[PDB]
Design a protein around this ligand. Structure first.
Ligand SMILES: Nc1ncnc2c1ncn2[C@@H]1O[C@H](COP(=O)(O)OP(=O)(O)O)[C@@H](O)[C@H]1O
Ligand SMILES: Nc1ncnc2c1ncn2[C@@H]1O[C@H](COP(=O)(O)OP(=O)(O)O)[C@@H](O)[C@H]1O
Ligand SMILES: Nc1ncnc2c1ncn2[C@@H]1O[C@H](COP(=O)(O)OP(=O)(O)O)[C@@H](O)[C@H]1O
Ligand SMILES: Nc1ncnc2c1ncn2[C@@H]1O[C@H](COP(=O)(O)OP(=O)(O)O)[C@@H](O)[C@H]1O
Ligand SMILES: Nc1ncnc2c1ncn2[C@@H]1O[C@H](COP(=O)(O)OP(=O)(O)O)[C@@H](O)[C@H]1O
Ligand SMILES: [Mg+2]
Ligand SMILES: [Mg+2]
Ligand SMILES: [Mg+2]
Ligand SMILES: [Mg+2]
Ligand SMILES: [Mg+2]
Lengths: 370, 370, 370, 370, 370
């Protein structure tokens, strides 16, 4: 048996290898109370974590300890993994090897410290790290294809061909679900709803996750939303006030396709996907315009696959096939991929041993892990 | 064992912790005789106190030493506490720790001097102070909720969530039972009954406490009382004259809901409750429109909970639940709360020691007490 | 000629373009009488406005019609502008184009309705709106710099570089002079002075505006004010009672730097200034840690510029220059900026014409105005 | 039975003697993967070979192990023959004698090592080597004639008369299909198509093999291609981009006739054919200007036989017959010749025995083989 | 008089013939503003160019219009030449003949369009184009030698002997200063510094240009940098943050010698230099292993000449002299060469006349120019 952990930028996911879904899924938040606890005997916790910090969030400040795939507060990341093992999953980490997951292009000391914690704090017997996107080929059941991952923290494009990683053609893009949440909060001020707080940041996250959709023609839908209320769905806040959302319902996720809206130098996930395909080779692109795998929760918007089709077919060569492979499992495809990978018998020889970590410190990972 | 004292703005309440009701309940009045004592050998007392000063009030002037939760004559407050311990409760204060109670937002030197007296005059071995409203959550058996206290002296609204005190959302309001007594005396002049004296102020207090009720539609009941005597109950004074009370029977307590009648800048206990809920957060209001706890003797009017329902449901968001939690114990809910709090074993480490008061003077309270 | 109006959250300012100061300066208050006018022949006005409502305030309720830069009662805002043109400035609005001013990030329907009134009610011939902070660069005579505005209603940080607005790096912060007034009123209860009324809210505003100052070391000055009366200045109320102000003299404006005191999620104007600089780019920050322009009446506290220096230099990179550009004109720097902008000949082509407002309704502003 | 192997400089060909075509035909390439194989369980092969290395070429580097008829990496040549016997042809080499083929004028240690491998590695029971060109007389069914072979690696002219080899009149010429591929890649840069990679070298090979043709008047067709698009056919790359090919469509194969274009000292296959005929004798040329046999894949261009006619008739004596014997089988004429030769019963006494190789080492070949 | 223009892939250089250095040197960038220009009267330019776009780069997007020696946006190239003549050099192009410069092997329509612009847009009276590398022999004062040019865009190796161009032995290689900048940015992510923007791409260019050096033993210096901080110099960004650079200080320019690091099929400038020498002839190599001229800004790394010595002496024949002729002028050696060439009186008959361009269009260049 082995444990698979998405270590998600947004939702953490964890479970046993060989399962079809993670068992623990919870937001990767640590909540700190921001007020004096006047009532004796409530035993107020000094730091809530996961969905506890959701339920109490009104009295809390919520912080993600992982920003853009970089762990920004390790002591909180420790609290999150501790909660995962003991409270949320109820498993002994000393008994089971752990497959962690990381974004690509990720600062090397992050992968180092990650294993320093996982061995010296949790005493995991054997361990591995793998790239979020790469696992999506396993959950797709494939050996070729270009993966759009788009977590809360990072969008990264990873072309793979015949199990070779084409590492020079990875594009990493900082548009991600968290930044779409923030941009929605920025434009949702246009109707005069104020949501500046982190407790309200979470509400804007729910509004995005439920009511938003990707425009299939941004200018036409801007025109029709200026002409008609047809699009103007309405949401009910945790205080029971109703709000109505105009063209913001799609102007927000359109940021994925014109990042100049966020002022970013980058380019849309469409154009950067195309550009990664252009970058990889002439030989393989025949097999990468088809078989565009797509992954992670930000790729969950309605209409996103259709927009990707339209854009890539507008960028790819004339009479080149395009196929945006978008399962319904996108939100878990990374974890499912890790579950498959850890299941494979032909992988059980690859785990980094605790004994090897005793032979050499965390730097061992840069030798053993790819 | 410990002693719990409401130190009420109106009725004092005192008793032992772990009891279900206070044992000493008496009006917080000191009476001074206002005439020459011509009869030798009666041993006329230079100052009556409590219900002694009730029974003799015709020859006395009655003064409350505590006004709007501020102790205005400490030497009389000393007489009241002395009477409590020795005459009314018959307990040694040197043997028992005392939980006093205070209104919130209360001038800091009041809490200082309160403890300076309680240690240096009464030599109490250990001591604490707590907020009147907060105790009502203990007597409600709760950890969330917004408390309307309305003593004789102060109305104060205190939202609490998960034992955090949301201190920025406390609203303190100077409409209170004493000022309703005075306003009733003002309008009861309209029938030509004169009650200007303090001895008659007490009679107006009894008239209010027995015959008045909160209108559920002030304009409609004004109309029907103009149309019909149906409401016109009658009271019999301590001299046996009968009086009849017209629409004054509800026009007086309606002051709680339109303080412009008293010319106050403030706003009704309904609208200020709603406004405190608006002030606290967006997250918690879901749990504060429900679970509106209500406390203190002025909240005892018939119809007040129904009016609160009507008003808050008229102010709170559409499809937001409202529940005015109004036990029958309202008149003692503060004291019962203190009895529970002092009972808790997990509180016995919090008492301010006499030894600590010897380490630092009364200012110690602002460190130890919250 | 043209008219420039600050439309201030607190003090309104208005005057002609090309002047060095506004001619009309008055508090943006409408006062309603709260009592029966028993004396015949006084001609009592149904609503006083501006400094009339100051002089009569004892019998009035005072309401600001503009809250946090949002016009909350347009009919009163109309009364304020009407008073400005006809009573206070004595100018015909039909004859002169008007430059209004708005806070940034401000609800879009506010800017719409603002122009709907300005054309259809006042028949202004041509019109414009501009961001309060942006004008401060004109009154500084600059084309780069980050502006702290802090009116009565809104603190907003606006970085500008080479005349490009870096709109993604605007931080809007709800700490402002009005909320410092309210917090001072909250803590000034600690000495037992009660000022709950709006008529007394104005007195607390004067106390703040005269006697308060920003602490340069909050903990040290708390210590020394606990040790010594050296800081304890005294104020004389409009009734001639004297009051003394302890550490409240600086504990109140310290709210600008630890908003957790107000329970706000936000962060101090120092840390949010630094964070806006971090947000804008890597290229320009060299020119924004220097040239921190500062604006609006809340930035008028003694010691505030020194504290900003200390904090930003504690946050900015080592060996990065910091310069808090704080003229004496701060209280008018917005209006002076508008006066310059309206003066420029190279701006006279930008006014929204009445003819254009006849071609398209108030929504025209979102096209013409930036 | 016997096995016949062309050991081609470009396409390998192998099959059984007495067949009319080779059964295994595949490019003589070994492909090495050039990237990290990140996917576990694909079993990535350390070296692909033949048409496997075609299909995967995008991730590979492709190397021919035989350059200009010289085996440049014997370990790869071993892999190619191993693939031929076991994977591609599925035959046991221990059971069948093998006729290998070599270019003429070829470094003697090549023929030595070739047999050292064929006996000691593959344990072939009996063996022979013969000259590529000479076999073409057998597949032509002739005993006189001059053979232009032009493989990928070597052009060599071999006059034969009455079965005597005229060995002093062999001309060996290093213009060959591979070098025409490279030159086409050089000039195809003139339109700005870049194909520098070996994976793209293969694409240029396909472009040459499909669209190019030999000009029948190079200057006139240069003129007409400058005048008109009539010649400008278009190709579609493996990525689906279209390209158009101008005069490059014939300027490339014209290198065979003006090698000064490649900067080579040599002379065209026309002039070197004529010069070999001049070199051989006066007696036989009557039978060699007629009966110019032509062989190998580079002789497959459209128009090449017509150009040979024009050139040789311009060089050969007046009133001398010229006949360029160009079957359609040119691409296999060598192998078919070997199939006939190995078929002949009057050849079965000529095989080098394994027993003879045990009597004397590989040097035995220079005695037995001619 | 005549004007000489390097038309550099990276830094443009221009000046008068007969000077010892170019007078205008500036980066060949056009900058477009990426934000709304809110300040009236700044006259914001729609496109900055050269070192203007450096100074303002924080608000710009920077694009090179020339990629790998191919002009990719002619309208921007026009802006660059216009800036050169009028703003940066302040010369009338109608009065002076212009020597432009091009990379070799360069798409023929580029040289065409280049002259179409130079005559029809700038009305230059007479004109020429020459190969970047070839000019380096003039600035070396030589008639033999093999030139490594390595601009920002192209590395190209050009052997020349006795003034004959050996055109079949030119090797063109796409490793160049821009791609080393990009690779440094890729590995500099390993320390967690993010520089993905073009504005930050320029900063990575400065970091490379100042702190990087070519390793003389890549494995040994990797070992010693793993053992010791001795190499770990530090840079200070335009925001004043310090960074430290580990083995990246040499791992980046090592890409020139193992392009497999960039995944390129190509081979190091050492091995490709050797291979060009192998390709040219047997006669001349005696004079090309000596007299390896070296050119262009990418050849400016410390240690590069020593590494070239080590590698070429490891590849060249035993007891063959090797001499890497590396002046200090490398960064300008092309321009200086053009200055000499345009100076020569025996060149003044070679200019393409405007009259000849009127006789035949831009295709004239392919006749006149070599
Ligand atoms: N149905 C949905 N519509 C729009 N956005 C969604 C939806 N579901 C999830 N998301 C976005 O995806 C985020 C989760 O991303 P996740 O896959 O957990 O990142 P990671 O892969 O790093 O764990 C959510 O917080 C939300 O912002
Ligand atoms: N049944 C009743 N109806 C109306 N008013 C009442 C009733 N009972 C008590 N009150 C009011 O409540 C007052 C007592 O308030 P109390 O709770 O003693 O204040 P505190 O909480 O400060 O002790 C009485 O004096 C009277 O004015
Ligand atoms: N000298 C001062 N010291 C402290 N606070 C001041 C001083 N002068 C003005 N203020 C504060 O600034 C407020 C005015 O802000 P103002 O600039 O009018 O806002 P706006 O920019 O929206 O018009 C005053 O009401 C007061 O609260
Ligand atoms: N139809 C064609 N047109 C032009 N060139 C061709 C054609 N067919 C084959 N070739 C060239 O001939 C090459 C094969 O030569 P080949 O006969 O295999 O050499 P060898 O005789 O050494 O085996 C091909 O790779 C290609 O370059
Ligand atoms: N001292 C240096 N160290 C390392 N690299 C340098 C140095 N000087 C210049 N370069 C590189 O050379 C580039 C300039 O190349 P350049 O000669 O202008 O190309 P071109 O020959 O096409 O004009 C610089 O942008 C930089 O990348
Ligand atoms: Mg994930
Ligand atoms: Mg009480
Ligand atoms: Mg203002
Ligand atoms: Mg062959
Ligand atoms: Mg150059």
């Amino acid at each position: 048996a082995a444990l698979v952990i998405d270590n998600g930028s947004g939702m953490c996911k964890a479970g046993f290898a060989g399962d079809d879904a993670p068992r623990a899924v919870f937001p990767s938040i640590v909540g700190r109370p921001r007020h004096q606890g006047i009532m004796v005997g409530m035993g107020q916790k000094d730091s809530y974590v996961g969905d506890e910090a959701q339920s109490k969030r009104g009295i809390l400040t919520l912080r993600y300890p992982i920003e853009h795939g970089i762990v920004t507060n390790w002591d909180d990341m420790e609290k999150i993994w501790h909660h995962t093992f003991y409270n949320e999953l109820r498993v002994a980490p000393e008994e089971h090897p752990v497959l962690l997951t990381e974004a690509p292009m990720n600062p090397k000391s992050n992968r180092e410290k990650m294993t320093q914690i996982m061995f010296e704090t949790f005493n995991v017997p054997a361990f591995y790290v793998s790239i979020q996107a790469v696992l999506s080929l396993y959950s797709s059941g494939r050996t070729t294809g270009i993966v759009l991952d788009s977590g809360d923290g990072v969008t990264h494009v990873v072309p793979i061909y015949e199990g070779f990683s084409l590492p020079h053609a990875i594009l990493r893009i900082d548009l991600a679900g968290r930044d779409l949440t923030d941009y929605l909060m920025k434009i949702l001020s246009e109707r005069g709803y104020s949501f500046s707080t982190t407790a309200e940041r979470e509400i804007v996250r729910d509004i995005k996750e439920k009511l938003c959709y990707v425009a299939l023609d941004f200018e036409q839908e801007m025109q029709t939303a200026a002409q008609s209320s047809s699009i103007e769905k309405s949401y009910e806040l945790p205080d029971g006030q109703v709000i109505t959302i105009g063209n913001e319902r799609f102007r927000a996720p359109e940021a994925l396709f014109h990042p100049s809206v966020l002022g970013l130098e980058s380019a849309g996930i469409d154009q950067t996907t195309y550009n990664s395909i252009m970058k990889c080779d002439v030989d393989v692109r025949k097999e990468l315009y088809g078989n565009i795998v797509m992954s992670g929760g930000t790729t969950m918007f309605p209409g996103i696959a259709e927009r990707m089709q339209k854009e890539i077919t507008a960028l790819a060569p004339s009479s080149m096939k395009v196929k945006i492979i978008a399962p319904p499992e996108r939100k878990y495809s990374v974890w499912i991929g890790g579950s498959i990978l850890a299941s494979l018998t032909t992988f059980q020889q690859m785990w980094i041993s605790k004994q090897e970590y005793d032979e050499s410190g965390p730097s061992i990972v840069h030798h053993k892990c790819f």
